[PDB]
Amino acid sequence: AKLLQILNVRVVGSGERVVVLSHGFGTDQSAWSRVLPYLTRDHRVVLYDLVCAGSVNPDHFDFRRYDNLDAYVDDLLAILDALRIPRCAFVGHSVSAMIGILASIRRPDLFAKLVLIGASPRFLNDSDYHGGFELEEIQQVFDAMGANYSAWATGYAPLAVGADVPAAVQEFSRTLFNMRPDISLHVCQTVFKTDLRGVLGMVRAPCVVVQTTRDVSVPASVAAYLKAHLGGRTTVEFLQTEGHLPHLSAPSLLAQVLRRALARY
Ligand SMILES: C/C(=C/[C@@H](O)Cc1ccc(Br)cc1)C(=O)O
């Protein structure tokens, strides 16, 4: 209930069908602004900010409770329950893909379908598992973030966007810089520690994994891994575009996949 204001919950559009948009690391809900109008004619759309977003009062960030993604799940479920929404489709980017997976296990009847964008169950490499990162690489990210956040963010923004799209780089950089540096590092650490591989099979909801041609945080092989192990019906949809944030950088292309995924559930 109090979360509705704290996490800046917005509900827009019209319809039978409820769709939740949950943003990823380094953005707030405004990252959905370019795809949103492709949805609001036929869908009731719920948007909110993760507690770590810069647009949320930093005094509300609990460094203890949110050192596990379960707490982010608690927030999402609390919002949906407050809104008295019994069933929805869920679209999650980055960390929100993990949140969505976990939420669908916690409350199977609540989530009719999952759309996962820039999605991975584990970033650290394991035997025969290519997550894209070794421990030492992960630690260097943390060190970089701690020592010089502005420089790390300046470097990270173009890499994450990937494609040559100035407005997307500018918009991602703005929200990344809007985060408080210590909160940004904390969430980064929390996500890198997370390993959802062992619970993928517990997901029952049908799922669409969105894959782009190149993702700096997600190897091309992860989508196939997710399709293989997610416990429901999973389809991989392919965007002929480059980057980690297609909702920012290629909203038209992504819109068509979203409208395709959200037509039936
Ligand atoms: C929280 C989070 C952290 C990392 O993935 C961000 C990242 C990824 C790759 C590189 Br290089 C530098 C930073 C996420 O993307 O979900």
UniProtKB/Swiss-Prot annotation:
Changing residue 244 to Y: Weakens interaction with D53 and attenuates strigolactone-induced degradation of D53. One of its GO terms (biological process) is strigolactone biosynthetic process. Expressed in the parenchyma cells of the root stele and lateral roots, vascular tissues of vein and leaf sheath, ligule base, auricle base and stem base. It is found in: Cytoplasm; Nucleus. Substrate binds at residues 94, 188, 244. Changing residue 26 to R: In d88; dwarf and high tillering phenotypes. It is an enzyme of class 3 (hydrolase). Involved in strigolactone (SL) signaling pathway. May function downstream of SL synthesis, as a component of hormone signaling or as an enzyme that participates in the conversion of SL to the bioactive form. Strigolactones are hormones that inhibit tillering and shoot branching through the MAX-dependent pathway, contribute to the regulation of shoot architectural response to phosphate-limiting conditions and function as rhizosphere signal that stimulates hyphal branching of arbuscular mycorrhizal fungi and trigger seed germination of root parasitic weeds. Belongs to the AB hydrolase superfamily. This is Strigolactone esterase D14. The chain holds residues 54 to 318 of 318 of the full protein.
